[PDB]
């Protein structure tokens, strides 16, 4: 438990490496910004603390160095450290690149998705714009609400237009 | 009849190298003149003055803006962001060329911008990038000078130039106010103008330029 001396081995849900692997440490946080009450003058008007919930660990490409001019992350092997239920799992990354097994590792953009579950690898040229991703979920999530709202009308069966 | 029209400045303060504040008072004006003058001069001051700034940048061996290079602590998008707020003073028409060809694990400032003599840098403390590796970088700038409300479409996609679409502001805020006085039979009025400016233009030259550029438009009605 957070900052406690009582130790216990975690739950293993997948095979783990038995050698020395040089990997990188990630995180998945929200930055809660709840607004606390004001008691005295000059009391803070807002709060902030990270809520890391998933620590992915991505192996280096054949365990290279940090400064050598061949730095590439090995996205095939990624291990997920959950927080809600203490456990370590190996990721199930997917590759849609037509090159398949034989490819250039100097740039293969990795896409993570909902709650650290989906995992895809795509060529770095076809990276989605920041606005397109935001507009994509907004369009999908609000088209369901509009359809749900319009479902109660008597003419919903004979209709069109979205 | 008496006290013909004139302008006088009481407050004129330069805070920093790229900040300029001025306030100006007009002469006895009749009723209603102050509003029209303030509105017209504010509309002219906001955008009428040509502003000289970069528009493009030719980065070599970078195919997309999210392709930050090792040795530079600022991403390519951040390099453009830094090369968006640079201040230049000039009287150019059209365009020119520039370059940044250095190799040193050190800081880079505005002095690195090779410029023709008719474009001069306004500040010297502005930062561009943060080099920390012995690598060679090349960014071919392209200056330009348009009017206030100029709308330009992206072009020249062949060589991989990254648009740095800018504001062309020498001004930053204009604030007009009026005062009025009555001697019992005469409603003498007064105008107050407050001008901020980028730095490539003293905020008194703005008073002259934004009036000349409006008189130029109003003259052809006498033709």
């Amino acid at each position: 438990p957070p900052d406690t001396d009582v130790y216990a081995i975690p739950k293993v849900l997948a095979p783990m490496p038995d050698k020395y692997i040089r990997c990188a440490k990630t995180d998945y946080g929200w930055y809660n910004v709840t607004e606390p009450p004001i008691d005295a003058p000059r009391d803070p008007m807002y709060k902030s603390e990270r809520e890391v919930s998933k620590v992915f660990l991505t192996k280096h490409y054949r365990n290279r160095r940090l400064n050598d001019p061949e730095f590439v992350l090995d996205f095939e092997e990624i291990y997920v450290i959950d927080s809600r239920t203490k456990s370590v799992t190996r990721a199930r990354v997917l590759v849609t690149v037509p090159e398949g097994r034989n490819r250039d590792r100097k740039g293969d953009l990795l896409v993570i998705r909902d709650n650290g579950n989906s995992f895809k690898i795509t060529h770095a040229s076809k990276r989605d714009d920041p606005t397109t991703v935001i507009e994509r979920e907004e369009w999908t999530r609000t088209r369901q609400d509009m359809e749900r709202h319009l479902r109660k009308l008597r003419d919903f069966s004979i209709s069109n237009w979205i | 009849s008496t006290q013909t029209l004139q302008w006088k400045c009481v407050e004129s303060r330069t805070d920093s190298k790229c900040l300029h504040y001025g306030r100006f008072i007009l002469s006895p004006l009749m009723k209603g003149q102050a509003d029209t003058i303030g509105i017209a001069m504010r509309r002219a001051l906001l955008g009428e003055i040509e502003g000289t700034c970069i528009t493009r940048a030719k980065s070599e061996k970078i195919p997309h803006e999210y392709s930050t290079i090792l040795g530079i602590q600022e991403s390519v998008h951040e390099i453009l962001m830094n090369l968006k707020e640079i201040v230049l003073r000039s009287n150019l028409y059209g365009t020119c060329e520039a370059s940044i060809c250095v190799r040193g694990p050190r800081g880079v400032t505005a002095q690195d911008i090779i410029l023709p003599p008719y474009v001069e840098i306004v500040d010297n403390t502005q930062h561009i990038a943060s080099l920390t590796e012995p690598i060679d970088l090349c960014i071919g700038l392209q200056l330009e000078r348009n009017r206030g409300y100029h709308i330009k479409a992206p072009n020249n996609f062949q060589d991989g130039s990254f648009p740095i679409d800018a504001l062309f502001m020498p001004v930053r805020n204009v604030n007009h106010s009026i005062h009025s006085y009555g001697n019992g039979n005469e409603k003498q009025e007064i105008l107050f103008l407050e001008i901020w400016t980028n730095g490539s233009l003293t905020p008194k030259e703005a008073l002259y330029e934004a009036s000349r550029n409006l008189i130029d438009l109003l003259i052809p009605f006498l033709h």
Binding site: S125, E138, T140, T142, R143 | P154
Partner: protein
């Protein structure tokens, strides 16, 4: 009333979803698609003030 309406209109935001785009942004197209990333690059996107 009046100041409240002014402040509400000021802090009202953009149009979130289907009220800002007629067609879905999934719409696999307009990628400037070819085998290389050397094509027309407009990318209107949004300003980066």
């Amino acid at each position: 009333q009046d100041m409240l309406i002014g402040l509400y209109i000021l802090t009202s935001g953009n149009r979130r979803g289907i009220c800002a785009n007629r067609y879905n942004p999934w719409n696999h197209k307009t990628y400037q698609n070819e085998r290389i990333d050397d094509t027309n690059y407009k990318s209107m996107k949004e300003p980066f003030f």
